[PDB]
Ligand binder design. Structure first.
Ligand SMILES: CCCCCCCCCCCCCCCCCC(=O)OC[C@H](COP(=O)([O-])OCC(O)COP(=O)([O-])OC[C@@H](COC(=O)CCCCCCCCCCCCCCCCC)OC(=O)CCCCCCCCCCCCCCCCC)OC(=O)CCCCCCCCCCCCCCCCC
Ligand SMILES: CCCCCCCCCCCCCCCCCC(=O)OC[C@H](COP(=O)([O-])OCC[N+](C)(C)C)OC(=O)CCCCCCCCCCCCCCCCC
Ligand SMILES: CCCCCCCCCCCCCCCCCC(=O)OC[C@H](COP(=O)([O-])OCC[N+](C)(C)C)OC(=O)CCCCCCCCCCCCCCCCC
Lengths: 221, 42, 199, 51, 110, 153, 49, 101, 102, 77, 50, 60, 105, 159, 95, 130
């Protein structure tokens, strides 16, 4: 083997034109039913990825939204909202892949604070309160230092994006609208919660309430 | 012990014999139970 | 069509390819069994010529093939049947074993769709076609001519094992040749059995 | 599975299905939908998790 | 038995509900996690998978194994902890999995 | 599927009813010899690969239900007929017709049900050319194709 | 009435349904290895529930 | 179940050596007295008794002894096996390289 | 004796739960180093890390390339599931200035 | 999945559409897509071999393909 | 049922029930084993689907 | 089944019986060695003696 | 321990006990620590096996959460504390590494 | 014992071990090793050599032993009726007596003809000497063949 | 066990004769149920096997068909390019 | 519970995959995944001919796309030509690509003829009965 084995030769076009394919016959095995199975392949594809129908008036492929059997059969003459078929992929490649769960995202306000309850209402309130604190810090700087800048040169992600998306996930739009009304009522008056909070004076002491908070944690490899 | 020496007399090593010796002991014991089961039936 | 009561022996059991429009509304279901399935032979009035009003029609009887018992009623199907002009390649057939399958203590009830055997005159009357003699002459069995012509093929309807075809299932060229239960090997076996019983 | 050009009157077909459609005793729920019909479908993927 | 069950419920579900009722300055998430953990995570869950063969056939067990590995993917879940592993073969017979830890993806059993 | 199984059963019944030619008989003999040896006369759990063991056991179970159990049932029916005849003749209970006539019925019906379903068992061994069982089945299949002047799967 | 009918009728019904009606399969399907199985009868009709 | 599993493993995965040990394999066996157990042997190169060069000799020694690679895993030994037993290669008998253990 | 057996079982469960560290420490000292090393070797699994292509084809070039101890993959396995943190222009520039080993 | 069976359509208009797409793709890819505007849709190529077996067999046949190429060249001038 | 339908009516061998009160040996224990098994079954199944 | 007298070989009495029969047959052959075609018994060959005396050696 | 190798934490051995001792009882990081114990079974004693196990921890953290290419390579402090929760890929990586460190044999 | 079959222990050179080889000459050692390998592990030989050795062994030891055992069993069947009278016949008893006598005499005759002719066949056969020179097995080959023979006997006992 | 203990355990009432006669009949009434349940369990297992295959190898076969069609196009394209080369040689004599 | 189902059908095996060139397809896909190429069109072995612009400029669409605007790196992946590193690590997967293409061409060369008498009962040979 030459010392350059595996190195792509200069000007390699990846072209198989005029190539002898009779040398690879010993590198694969086809069973006796390969001819039959091939047809089956085609059959399945022709009846599985064909969610579109050719139209003679337009002479092109069209489609509609998923419909029940009764509507497809006994209302085939009365079809509404026909859209020209655009293709599964823009470049014509295959898209038939088995999918899975994508990696999760970082959590600022954990769901485990209120996870015994299937209904997320206290969690919704907590997440919205945290986002509202962050927003009260940054709400008026958004159009000059953050997402709403005129030019992309000074573009920066809004610091409360993750908390906002967590609050949106935890709350329905109705409860989110209620909390946004409260947020407007408290941002018009610039009511930071620290201006009124005193309940820490009437709360039981805890090991986490030590004056030396940085030295309470023991770090270990 | 005795089977170990017997199987080492045949071309074998001490480690390999133990694996082979166990199988014969298990097989002979199974036959003894089969003989014991046959005696109870008849 | 050239088929007639007098010329039928010229066209009997002969492959034609005729264009016309089938009437799935008035289809007759002759009881039959195919590969252990109790289903029906699906006869339809095949309209070849008709006037614009549609009151006067003439045609033939077309055996569309075997249709299972579950899907015999029109409301049981997930399709709206096509009754426009279609071309069907069919073997002209007398329709003999269908007319001799009722057995004793069996009779057809027309004026309703109740059939036990293919009584040609009653089927012709049910069709309502004007050319009664030609309709009574024969029936055209929907066949697939891309199949072996031997009677030993043992695939009588054009299907696969998985039944991936669509009902009704048309006949193969061996299916048309096949008389159910009266082939020469069956009669030879019966003759041998009765000779053994007698001697 | 072809969007052909209809030679019938589609309104007449719709009104004839509305007026008098053939039914039977053992008719599947697929072919007999009278209270379970909507104008939109909620489409979701299969073999995956949706909250 | 009913009294023991009721006392167990009130011990970890009713009374701990009153521990935190106001926003907390220090380690609020820690305290809320403590309260929730002593309630959300129960012992029975582990058995619910430790004897999964009592109703899951081999192939259904394989499919539910991949499904459970997907559904308990999130790390911040104390209920996933104290739950018997899905990285296991079916006790009766295993078809898909040849070895416990021979995968091509970390978070997928194949 | 149930439809596939019923079609296979009824087609086998029709083939046995019409007859079995001569070259068809030779091919059937080759297929039956291969199936008998490699499935009935061999422990299907002794194959090297898991695919071979699984599908050979599936073929053996099919043989057990379609040949062994069917032949046992038909031989038992024949033995029951002879037993009823002998009970009526002797006007008392007898036991001899059960073992002897049952064995004779099994020996009469096992070849019949094996000849009827030889192709079914032969095809179920088509695990592939990568395995020993598949290679042997493919060799026998090529011989049968030479005999019958056709191509099978 | 009490024993024989309540312990054999449904099994007979399912066996006849599979033997004759092919378990009510819609036969116009492509690939058995890729198709759902039409199960035999499993809900007993001879029990009150 | 240990007995059943071991019996299945033995029956499935046991074949006779099916070949005569080659000259190279026998020579390696006779030189296996040079193998040291629990402590690696210090291989010293003497050109008048070993020949070749120091690098090539040390590479061959590492292949033969230190690497643990068996004689039947050497390419030239495999070629000799497939050449000297071609009569058994014919008639559809496959030669087994590593003896069963 | 039924009450005594039930009490013993309950105490065993309590001790197993509460003295897990002590029990595991005692169990780790019941076998010598060699036995534990053998057990650890038997339980060694890849768990899906670095599960790159394993060439089964005999003429595959990547077979010889992987046998080479100096072969560099285009990206490290743990980095195959991490989002890129540099601009597309930088990525294309680095890839176009990239040079193959050997 | 319960996928029903329907054989290749061989519809005149559908196969004309698919064959026009195939000819466009052949003309585009024969010059490594050096055209000013490329109208080829690769996905429809797949369907040409799933629903037009007659035209696919014609295209595979060397004489039929030669005739098709000659006619296309005449059309393109 | 057979007994009470065939041999417990007055004209078919009735019994002189002379027992004032019942004296049982772990009665409910035998009457609660069958239900408890059911409970187990149900619980297990639910957990799996949950 | 039929083959268990072979398993009876472990007893030293059976081995002695076999040795007596074999030696008597060897004497018969040696006295008949004058007839052409019979090899006879040679007492100067190691192989013959080793096969004779070690046949039942190490029996288990 | 749905993501780990053992049905119960007691089969993990001394490594799982040390993982339990590392974090508070309500901290889900323990499970991640357990995965470290799984990655360094036959690898901790081998000098390159330890690096392989650390790479396995990095891959595991990258698969659980969305991560950036340099993110796990610029962690200033790899030490863990009792109240460290697996809310970030950095925390998952740190817990997994701590579990790897505590795998004797 | 009754549990296992031990007809192969004292036949076809199964009893050859290293003690038979330590005292043998180089040529005698080669002959003994080849005989043991050919009888116990025929796979080590080419198929033509296997056929030749089987033919040379059958007409001298195997088939001759079968015939001698058959003759000695026929010696034990001078009268097949054995116990038999006009009043009563004993078919099952006579069959049992035959199955107890004839196998025993067969075993005795077979062991005798192996005890007499096997050493002479090993030491005075031209085919054995020629094939031993052709193959020229070593002590390592004999050790491997001994292991293979024991493992094959174990496998046969298992099945 | 203890006959007296087991003959009055059920609330001092005696149903032991019917309990004894119950085993013999109950030993056979469960056979049809058991065999049909075996059939149903096998059907469920086959359906789960089909679900696994369709989930895993379902998408893969569609890609294989896609590649088969692309390869047919590739063969046609090679022949078309050969024709283009011939037409480049014979500028207009080919037509 | 313990034996509530009273039986488990362990005899029925996993559905055997009998696709013509599935093994070669999976080998080629694994090899291409090793190359770590952003373009997905490389999944098909015919990419040099179907999308030749992958080797010249990467313009695979004539501005008839809907992947959103080029604001992040994960945009216009098919509109990105193969770099030198991608080309090298794809060339390393050339033999498996060739074997896959040869298998596809041989399968295409297979035609249904009149000697396939077992076509109507090909399911049994395909091993669909368990
Ligand atoms: C002569 C006598 C010979 C006896 C030999 C010993 C018996 C061996 C039996 C083995 C059966 C077995 O293992 O099956 C497993 C087999 C498992 O199937 P699988 O593994 O899914 O795969 C199917 C095979 O691939 C393919 O399976 P298949 O489709 O071929 O199914 C056939 C199978 C189907 O299996 C059966 O039919 C089993 C037997 C059913 C019950 C028999 C009567 C018991 C009555 C008890 C009291 C009831 C109250 O039948 C047999 O194998 C029977 C062989 C012997 C026939 C003659 C028996 C006579 C004596 C009966 C006592 O079981 C089935 O297939 C179940 C199907 C039947 C369900 C129940 C149907 C009705 C039963 C009740 C009948 C009527 C009784 C009451 C009369 C009065 C009513 C009012
Ligand atoms: C929880 C408890 C439930 C049951 C409690 C009791 C209440 C219900 C009592 C029902 C009583 C029986 C009613 C049905 C009677 C007919 C049986 C039937 O059709 O079953 C359907 C079953 C099933 O029929 P099938 O095969 O059509 O199944 C249905 C199939 N599908 C669903 C697919 C459409 O049929 C049989 O079982 C037929 C065989 C048995 C026939 C028995 C006839 C002989 C009767 C002897 C009586 C006793 C001896 C008398 C001697 C006299 C001497 C002088
Ligand atoms: C407690 C009730 C016990 C008696 C139930 C009687 C039958 C009730 C019924 O309608 O069952 C449906 C079943 C029908 O079963 P099925 O509805 O499952 O039928 C399957 C076949 N398809 C789906 C195509 C219709 O009825 C019978 O089987 C009737 C048997 C005779 C009953 C005679 C009673 C007198």
């Amino acid at each position: 083997l030459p010392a350059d084995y595996g190195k792509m030769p200069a000007g390699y076009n990846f072209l198989t034109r005029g190539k002898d394919w009779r040398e690879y016959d010993k590198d694969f095995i086809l069973r006796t039913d390969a001819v039959w199975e091939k047809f089956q392949l085609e059959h399945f594809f022709r009846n599985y990825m064909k969610c579109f129908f050719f139209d003679h008036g337009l002479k092109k492929y069209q489609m509609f939204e998923p419909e029940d059997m009764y509507t497809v059969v006994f209302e085939g003459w009365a079809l509404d909202d026909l859209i020209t078929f655009p293709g599964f992929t823009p470049t014509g490649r295959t898209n038939s892949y088995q999918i899975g769960l994508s990696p999760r995202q970082r959590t600022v306000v954990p769901t485990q604070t209120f996870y015994q309850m299937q209904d997320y209402y206290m969690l919704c309130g907590l997440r919205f309160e945290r986002w509202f604190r962050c927003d009260l810090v940054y709400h008026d700087q958004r159009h000059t230092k953050f997402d709403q800048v005129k030019n992309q040169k000074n573009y920066k992600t809004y610091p409360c994006y993750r908390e906002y998306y967590e609050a949106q996930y935890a709350c329905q739009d109705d409860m989110f609208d209620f909390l946004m009304e409260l947020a407007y009522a408290r941002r018009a008056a610039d009511n930071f919660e620290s201006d009124f909070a005193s309940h820490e004076l009437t709360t039981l002491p805890t090991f986490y309430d030590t004056p030396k908070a940085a030295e309470r944690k023991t770090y270990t490899y | 012990g005795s089977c170990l020496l017997i199987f080492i007399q045949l071309v074998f090593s001490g480690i390999v014999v133990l694996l082979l010796d166990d199988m014969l002991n298990k097989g002979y014991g199974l036959g003894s139970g089969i003989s014991l089961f046959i005696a109870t039936n008849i | 069509p050239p088929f007639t009561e007098k010329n039928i022996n010229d066209w009997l059991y002969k492959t034609v390819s005729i264009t016309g429009r089938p009437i799935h509304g008035k289809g007759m279901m002759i009881p039959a069994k195919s590969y252990g399935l109790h289903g029906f032979e699906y006869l339809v009035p095949f309209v070849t010529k008709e006037n614009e009003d549609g009151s006067v029609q003439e045609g033939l009887i077309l055996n569309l093939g075997f249709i299972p018992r579950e899907y015999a009623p029109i409301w049981a199907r997930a399709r709206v049947e096509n009754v426009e002009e279609q071309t069907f390649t069919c073997v002209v057939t007398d329709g003999k074993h269908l007319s001799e399958q009722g057995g004793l203590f069996a009779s057809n009830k027309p004026c309703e769709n109740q059939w036990e055997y293919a009584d040609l005159d009653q089927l012709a009357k049910h069709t309502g076609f004007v050319n009664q003699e030609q309709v009574r002459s024969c029936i055209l069995e929907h066949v697939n001519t891309e199949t072996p012509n031997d009677e030993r093929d043992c695939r009588h309807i054009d299907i696969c094992s998985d039944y991936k075809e669509d009902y009704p299932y048309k006949f193969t060229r061996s299916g048309v040749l096949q008389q159910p239960g009266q082939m020469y090997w069956d009669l030879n076996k019966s003759a041998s059995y009765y000779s053994l019983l007698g001697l | 599975k072809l969007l052909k050009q209809s030679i019938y009157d589609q309104t007449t077909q719709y009104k004839l299905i509305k007026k008098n459609k053939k039914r039977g005793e053992l008719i599947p729920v697929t072919l007999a939908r009278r209270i379970l019909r909507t104008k939109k479908t909620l489409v979701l993927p299969a073999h995956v998790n949706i909250t | 038995v009913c009294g023991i069950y009721v006392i167990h419920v009130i011990y970890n579900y009713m009374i701990p509900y009153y521990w935190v009722s106001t926003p907390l300055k220090n380690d609020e998430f820690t305290r809320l996690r403590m309260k929730d953990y002593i309630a959300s995570t129960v012992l029975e869950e582990v058995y619910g998978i430790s004897y999964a063969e009592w109703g899951w056939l081999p192939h259904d067990f394989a499919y539910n194994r991949m499904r459970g590995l997907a559904g308990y993917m999130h790390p911040d879940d104390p209920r996933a902890m104290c739950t018997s592993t899905f990285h296991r073969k079916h006790k009766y017979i295993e078809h898909e999995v040849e070895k416990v830890g021979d995968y091509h993806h970390m978070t997928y059993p194949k | 599927s149930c439809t596939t199984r019923r079609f296979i059963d009824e087609k086998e019944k029709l083939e046995y009813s019409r007859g079995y030619n001569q070259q068809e008989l030779e091919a059937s003999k080759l297929r039956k010899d291969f199936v008998k040896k490699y499935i009935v006369d061999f422990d299907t759990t002794l194959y090297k690969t898991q695919v071979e063991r699984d599908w050979a056991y599936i073929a053996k179970r099919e043989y057990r239900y379609e040949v062994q159990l069917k032949s046992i049932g038909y031989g038992g029916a024949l033995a029951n007929a002879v037993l009823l005849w002998r009970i009526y003749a002797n006007k008392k209970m007898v036991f001899w017709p059960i073992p002897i006539v049952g064995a004779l019925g099994y020996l009469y019906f096992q070849p019949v049900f094996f000849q009827k379903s030889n192709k079914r068992f032969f095809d179920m061994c088509n695990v592939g050319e990568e395995y020993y069982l598949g290679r042997e089945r493919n060799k026998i299949l090529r011989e049968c194709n030479k005999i019958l002047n056709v191509e099978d799967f | 009435i009490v024993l024989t009918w309540g312990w054999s009728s449904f099994q007979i019904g399912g066996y006849n349904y599979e033997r004759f009606d092919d378990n009510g399969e819609r036969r116009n399907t492509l690939y058995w290895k890729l198709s759902p199985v039409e199960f035999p009868q499993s809900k007993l009709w001879n029990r009150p529930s | 179940t240990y007995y059943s599993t071991n019996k299945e493993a033995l029956i499935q995965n046991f074949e006779p050596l099916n070949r005569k040990f080659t000259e190279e394999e026998v020579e390696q066996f006779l030189r296996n007295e040079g193998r040291s157990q629990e402590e690696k042997r210090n291989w010293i190169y003497n050109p008048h008794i070993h020949g070749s060069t120091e690098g090539e000799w040390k590479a061959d020694i590492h292949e033969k002894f230190d690497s643990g690679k068996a004689p039947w895993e050497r390419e030239h030994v495999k070629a000799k096996i497939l050449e000297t037993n071609k009569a058994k290669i014919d008639a559809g008998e496959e030669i087994q390289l590593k003896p069963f253990k | 004796v039924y009450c005594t057996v039930l009490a013993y079982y309950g105490w065993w469960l309590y001790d197993r739960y509460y003295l897990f560290g002590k029990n595991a420490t005692q169990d780790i000292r019941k076998d010598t180093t060699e036995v534990w090393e053998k057990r650890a070797a038997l339980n060694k699994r890849n768990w899906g890390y670095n599960a790159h292509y394993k060439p089964e084809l005999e003429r595959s070039m990547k077979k010889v390339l992987y046998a080479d101890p100096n072969y560099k993959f285009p990206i490290e396995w743990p980095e195959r599931y991490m989002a890129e943190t540099k601009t597309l222009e930088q990525v294309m520039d680095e890839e176009e200035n990239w040079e193959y080993y050997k | 999945m319960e996928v029903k069976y329907r054989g290749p359509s061989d519809d005149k208009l559908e196969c004309e559409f698919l064959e026009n797409n195939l000819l466009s793709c052949l003309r585009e890819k024969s010059v490594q897509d050096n055209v000013a505007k490329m109208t080829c849709r690769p996905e429809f190529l797949v369907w040409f071999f799933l629903e037009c077996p007659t035209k696919a067999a014609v295209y595979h046949d060397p004489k039929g393909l030669r005739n098709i190429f000659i006619q296309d060249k005449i059309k393109q001038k | 049922i057979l007994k009470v339908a065939r041999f417990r009516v007055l004209k078919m061998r009735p019994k002189i029930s002379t027992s004032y009160r019942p004296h049982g040996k772990w009665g409910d224990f035998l009457a609660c084993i069958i239900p408890l098994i059911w409970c187990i079954n149900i619980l297990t199944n639910s957990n799996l689907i949950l | 089944p039929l083959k268990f007298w072979w398993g009876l070989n472990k007893f030293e009495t059976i081995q002695g019986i076999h040795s007596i029969l074999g030696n008597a047959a060897d004497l018969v052959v040696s006295t008949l060695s004058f007839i052409p075609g019979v090899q006879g018994r040679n007492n100067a060959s190691y192989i013959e003696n080793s096969i004779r005396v070690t046949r039942f050696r190490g029996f288990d | 321990m749905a993501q780990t190798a053992h049905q119960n934490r007691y089969q993990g051995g001394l490594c799982y006990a040390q993982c339990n001792e590392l974090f508070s009882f309500w901290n889900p990081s323990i499970q991640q620590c357990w995965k470290g114990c799984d990655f360094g079974v036959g690898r901790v004693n081998d000098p390159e096996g330890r690096i392989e196990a650390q790479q396995m921890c990095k891959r595991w953290a990258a698969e659980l959460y969305w991560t950036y290419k340099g993110e796990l390579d610029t962690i200033k402090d790899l030490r863990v504390h009792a109240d460290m929760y697996p809310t970030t890929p950095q925390n998952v990586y740190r817990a997994c590494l701590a579990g790897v460190r505590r795998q004797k044999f | 014992f009754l549990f296992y079959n031990q007809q192969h222990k004292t036949r076809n050179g199964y009893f050859i071990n290293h003690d038979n080889l330590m005292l043998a000459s180089l040529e005698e050692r080669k002959k003994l090793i080849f005989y043991f390998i050919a009888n116990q592990v025929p796979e080590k030989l080419d198929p033509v050599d296997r056929v030749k050795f089987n033919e040379e062994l059958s007409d001298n030891l195997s088939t001759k032993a079968r015939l001698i055992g058959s003759l000695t069993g026929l010696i034990g069947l001078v009268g097949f009726p054995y116990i038999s009278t006009r009043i009563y016949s004993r078919p099952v008893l006579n069959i049992g007596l035959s199955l107890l006598i004839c196998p025993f005499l067969y075993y005795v005759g077979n062991q005798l003809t192996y005890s007499v002719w096997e050493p002479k066949f090993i030491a005075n056969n031209n085919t054995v000497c020629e094939l031993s020179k052709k193959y020229n097995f070593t002590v390592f080959d004999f050790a491997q063949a001994k292991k293979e023979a024991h493992l094959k006997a174990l496998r046969t006992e298992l099945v | 066990r203890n006959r007296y203990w087991w003959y009055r355990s059920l609330y001092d009432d005696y149903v032991a004769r019917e309990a004894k006669l119950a085993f013999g009949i109950a030993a056979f009434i469960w056979l049809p149920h058991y065999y049909w349940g075996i059939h149903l369990n096998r059907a469920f297992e086959v359906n789960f096997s089909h679900r696994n295959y369709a989930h895993e190898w379902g998408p893969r076969r569609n890609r294989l068909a896609h590649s088969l069609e692309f390869e047919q196009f590739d063969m046609i394209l090679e022949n078309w390019q050969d024709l283009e080369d011939e037409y480049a040689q014979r500028g207009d004599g080919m037509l | 519970a313990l034996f509530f189902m009273a039986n488990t059908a362990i005899s029925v095996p996993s559905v055997l995959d009998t696709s013509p060139c599935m093994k070669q397809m999976l080998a080629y896909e694994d090899c291409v995944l090793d190359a770590n190429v952003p373009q997905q069109e490389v999944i098909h072995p015919q990419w040099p001919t179907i999308w030749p612009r992958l080797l010249t400029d990467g313009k695979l669409l004539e501005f008839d796309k809907v992947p959103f605007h080029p604001e992040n790196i994960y945009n216009y992946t098919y509109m990105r030509p193969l770099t030198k590193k991608n080309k090298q690590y794809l060339y390393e997967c050339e033999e498996e690509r060739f074997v896959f293409k040869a298998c596809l061409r041989k399968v295409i060369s297979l035609k249904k003829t009149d000697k396939h008498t077992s076509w109507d009962t090909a399911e049994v040979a395909n091993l669909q009965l368990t």
